[PDB]
Design a protein around this ligand. Structure first.
Ligand SMILES: [Zn+2]
Lengths: 139, 98, 24, 149, 129
RNA sequence: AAGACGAUCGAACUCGGUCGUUUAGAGGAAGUAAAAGUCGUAACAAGGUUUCCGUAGGUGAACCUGCGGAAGGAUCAUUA
RNA sequence: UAUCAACUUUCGAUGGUAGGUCCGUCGCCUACCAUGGUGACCACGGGUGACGGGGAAUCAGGGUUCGAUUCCGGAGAGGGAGCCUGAGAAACGGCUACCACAUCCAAGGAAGGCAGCAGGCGCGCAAAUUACCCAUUUCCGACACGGAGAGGUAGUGACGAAAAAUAACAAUGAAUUGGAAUGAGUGCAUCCCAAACCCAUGGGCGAGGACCCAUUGGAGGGCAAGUCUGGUGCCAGCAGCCGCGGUAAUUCCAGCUCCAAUAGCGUAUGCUAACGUUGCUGCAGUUAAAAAGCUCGUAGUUGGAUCUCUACUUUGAAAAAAUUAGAGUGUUCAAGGCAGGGCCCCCCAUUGAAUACCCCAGCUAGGAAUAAUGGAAUAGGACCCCGGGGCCAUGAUCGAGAGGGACGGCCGGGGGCAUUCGUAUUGCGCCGCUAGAGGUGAAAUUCUUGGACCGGCGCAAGACGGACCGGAGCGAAAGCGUUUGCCAAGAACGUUUUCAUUAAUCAAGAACGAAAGUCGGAGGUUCGAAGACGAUCAGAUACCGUCGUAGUUCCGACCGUAAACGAUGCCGACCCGCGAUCCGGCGGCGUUUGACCCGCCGGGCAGCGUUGCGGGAAACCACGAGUCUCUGGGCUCCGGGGGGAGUAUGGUUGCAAAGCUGAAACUUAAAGGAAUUGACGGAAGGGCACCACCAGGAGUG
């Protein structure tokens, strides 16, 4: 059990500090890993250049083709697979364009039936993808 | 889930017992966990005691008995219908069947 | 079975040391 | 329970409430001290002296007939041994076990008991050094202990 | 071994109370226990008790009135100031209307209300309600 | 005033050592995902050889076998 | 942060002495000596997307996180180093060098430092005018006068915070009607302000779809809000999660409608509460992730009762403001400000511009409970007398249903050594008879007229210790069963014996530790990994059978692993009942030559009734898994969704096999615990029909 001694503040402080590393949520934010492997490097959004136009298939029991894009970031040159959210917005995307990608819902976790996509496109050609979908800023 | 309070054997305050071997399969089973069955039967079955009595050279000769100590493992004791499964509450009865 | 998965890992990391000790 | 073994047995003495000598005990304080001195000279530990006085002389408690305990009576006169009786018997046992352990080499039970006894020797001697009963340089050596018993 | 004999005293009382007993025997006697049982008795939680005095630690036999819900100790025995006393009342006492926290101050072993009137703090022994 | 023997502070360069962090690699060997493929049926009903555990060997594969142990067994019980 | 356990000390590390040097103290430095100094209470080394603090965010209480940022202190002006002047600098809007970078050039040379205010480039998800004035705030100077990108005022600005329009009021059954009401805006005066700008005060324009139009996300559930309509048809797409789309979609694409907040709102990533899923308050470890195999052992933590009935606690002193809390006060209210109120050239309201908090440590004055600690024991100990005397009640708390030790009679498959015996098993010898014998579901391999199997006689070898043998004993566990002897040890009980707290649990350490395995010898009966062969099968390197190597046994030395299990750490307290059992002790009435019978006490292995006074998700638990929201006896180890994975790497140990220590990228929405119902079983028991069978009749194919 616990040591309730009046001079056990050192034993309690050392035990609690060590057991916090067995927490998955704590060891992820207080280590070099999970941040060096993070392509964004701890940022909210990121800009990149579109390399290809790949379509990943949704996992079971779903059946569809997710319109994704192979993007290479600028600040570190890493290759990520963003997601073009809305309907037909992949046509607004052209290869070798400047797109502002961001996270996808869950932090560093694949959202929905998409196999390994954990990012999504926010802007393209320095204009927002949402305005292109609503008939504004025709680009 | 724990099926038996005695863990299917009779060992209280010990760490290891001498393992004995079964009779019809020769499997190493602990001495306390084995299902023992002391069968005491005459050498001559009831179908031939009369024929031996007529062929006996004595006047009053009691036929001997055959003392056989049988040790059955749990697998063979159930297969040979020596023991059977019982209800969850009927398992606690330790009195042998009359 | 779980005891054979442990037996494979023992035989897997045993040959890993062979191909690692031979390169030194 | 015990210190180096399991068991919660309570087998000890139960001293009475009356801290007074009975009326049928005519031995005065001087007579009891003379009996202790005669028994202490012939090599009887304070534990053994109190047993004889209790079972043959009716002295239920030497602490009641006199004003001091048996060891303090010997310490005042100067008949107390160099090392205490309890520490002497622990070393006596360790030498007997070690002498048995050097002949019988593969008795892991005796080797296990030798660690238990030597652990009690070091903690009992540590208490005596704090009470200044033993010199600070005192140390139990497994080789030179046989000459102390 | 037997440490904090006050805990073994209040645990024996709390158990014997829930069993419906009328008298409980406490094996080790102490002045800290008597000062604790006196505060519980002055507020009408326990009756009279005879301090059985043998030539040893001594035993106590306490009468029970059926009015006690639970009596316990605070094992680390923290140092309670006059400002932090309000925090201990909310956590330990089941209501602001009854229940007491027996403290140990320089003026003697007493409850928390008397420590407020005498304007003094100290260490905390336990509670009863 | 230039200039110069010398002692101290000491930048900097070069070549070693050490520490920390990115990265290429024939070939080798795993994990995971997609598993809508092939072979067998190891496990779950005594899963058709009860399951398992430690150790060791063997075998296309799951696995098989020897030794001791466990019931989380398929027996809380078998009669002088 | 231990995957950093020893570090410092030739070449100053710790100290001593003499001196040098400095404004002055000092290994600050030099010279001679000393061998020290720090560390498990974490030194040293490494990491920091570390300037410290006043503070900030969020909070029921505790806490968690943040603090480059206007206040204080420190540090640096591209990187280091050196110096000049001066009261003050190791200054860079001073200087001299080298390094990097860079400017002009008649190619000889010269010159440079925006982490100052604007501005440019680069970098990025990410951050404003190459503006005005020294009028306010203050500073500097020979000075009332000069200067100040310090500062102030505008510009940019949805970082945010406060106030607050987008209508109000009446008849008639609505882009119907009707007159009223001030703003937005727009100019013109005044005010404002160094000039301007903004606000405010007026008057002139200024609303009827008061066209002077409110967006941003949703409408299956969580979660307030459509069985609407059209389109698409597992496509396109939606969806944080569960899911939706498979031609009649409340979830997609749109129309209409509705809901929520509102000049805002959605999203992404951090952070806090949610989270009692890091649990000091306040979590768990039988079966869901979990107590080391076991014991010993120092640091550490925690320690019985007992005497007048320096930690703690209280007070005071001291403390930068701002911030926070908070008193007063109608900036039109408010965020805020520290000002301003009342009377006919003043006066009154001492006009106000409070007060609280400021951990810990240090300082001060009280209290004396609780927790440590010291005092007289080989006394010259305290007081006197005045080296000898006098004197004190002359000075030792209790022995714990704490512990150690002793002693007494016992008890036990406890351990070591030696000895004895027992039948079996295999082999061998002789004799008898005889042709099969072995084995299997059935057979075969194998062994057989050179005599197998079977009977009798007795010889050798190595294992093993059946039955008795038990929900019995002992041991710290692993483990332990023939007789007898020897050696040492142990629990319990008994005691009016002794010591007098010596204790409990315990990091890094240490002993022991089944089976298998490794090394060197001895041995090798049975069994038997591997292997060979004979079956079985679609195949069968398996299950079955016949032979059989390493092993299995002993000695010495390693490995330190198990479903090492009660899947339940150790010590202590309280807490139900009953009948047995083993050991010691006590008492009682007989029977039998100690045995047996009936109770009591202590300890131990367990059981039943508890329908458990209680606990828990059940199952189940009185060797507690009870006395935890009415949450606190002490302590150690240890768990944090499932996989990757006990894997990679590093350290360490080992002859090796491997042990201990031990991640991450990535992947996943479940995995799992207990119980219920049903289905199923080459599981058991009990029953029923020719759409089943036995015995048969007709056939059919
Ligand atoms: Zn069997």
């Amino acid at each position: 059990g616990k040591c309730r001694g009046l001079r056990t503040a050192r034993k309690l402080r050392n035990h609690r500090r060590e057991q916090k590393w067995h927490d998955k949520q704590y060891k992820k934010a207080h280590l070099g890993t999970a941040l060096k492997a993070n392509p964004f490097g701890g940022a909210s959004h990121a800009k990149g250049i579109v390399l290809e136009k790949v379509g990943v298939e949704a996992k079971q029991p779903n059946s569809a083709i997710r319109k994704c894009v192979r993007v290479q970031l600028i600040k570190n040159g890493k290759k990520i697979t963003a997601f073009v959210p809305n309907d037909g917005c992949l046509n607004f995307i052209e290869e070798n364009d400047e797109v502002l990608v961001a996270g996808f819902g869950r932090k560093g976790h694949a959202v929905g039936d998409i196999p390994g996509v954990r990012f999504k496109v926010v802007k393209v050609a320095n204009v927002s993808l949402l305005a292109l979908y609503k008939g504004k800023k025709e680009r | 889930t724990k099926k038996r309070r005695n863990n299917g054997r009779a060992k209280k305050g010990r760490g290891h017992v001498q393992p004995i071997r079964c009779t019809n399969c020769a499997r190493c089973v602990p001495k306390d966990k084995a299902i023992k069955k002391f069968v005491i039967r005459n050498i001559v079955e009831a179908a031939a005691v009369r024929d031996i009595s007529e062929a006996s050279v004595f006047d009053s000769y009691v036929l001997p008995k055959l003392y056989v100590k049988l040790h059955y493992c749990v697998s063979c004791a159930i297969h040979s219908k020596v023991v059977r499964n019982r209800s969850r509450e009927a398992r606690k009865d330790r009195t042998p069947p009359p | 079975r779980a005891k054979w998965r442990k037996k494979r890992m023992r035989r897997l990391k045993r040959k890993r040391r062979k191909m690692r000790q031979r390169s030194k | 329970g015990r210190m180096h073994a399991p068991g919660k047995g309570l087998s000890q003495s139960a001293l009475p409430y009356r801290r007074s000598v009975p009326t049928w005990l005519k031995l005065t304080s001087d007579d009891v001290k003379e009996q202790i001195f005669k028994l202490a000279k012939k090599g009887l530990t304070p534990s053994q002296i109190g047993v004889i006085l209790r079972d043959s002389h009716g002295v239920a408690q030497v602490r009641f007939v006199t004003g001091n305990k048996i060891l303090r009576i010997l310490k005042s006169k100067g008949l107390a041994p160099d090392l205490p009786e309890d520490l002497y018997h622990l070393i006596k046992k360790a030498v007997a076990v070690r002498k048995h352990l050097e002949r019988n080499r593969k008795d892991k039970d005796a080797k296990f008991r030798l660690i238990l006894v030597e652990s009690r020797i070091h903690r009992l001697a540590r208490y005596y050094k704090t009470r200044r009963v033993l010199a600070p340089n005192w140390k139990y050596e497994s080789s030179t202990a046989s000459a102390l018993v | 071994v037997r440490m904090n004999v006050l805990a073994d005293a209040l645990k024996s009382i709390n158990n014997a109370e829930k069993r419906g007993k009328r008298q409980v025997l406490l094996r080790p006697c102490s002045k800290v226990i008597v000062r604790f049982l006196t505060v519980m008795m002055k507020h009408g939680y326990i009756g009279e008790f005879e301090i059985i005095d043998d030539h040893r630690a001594g035993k106590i036999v306490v009468n029970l009135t059926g009015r006690l819900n639970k009596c316990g100790v605070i094992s680390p025995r923290f140092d309670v100031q006059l400002k932090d006393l309000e925090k201990w009342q909310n956590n330990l006492l089941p209501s602001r209307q009854f229940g007491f926290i027996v403290l140990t101050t320089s003026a003697g072993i007493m409850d928390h209300e008397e420590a407020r009137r005498k304007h003094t703090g100290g260490k905390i022994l336990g509670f009863f309600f």
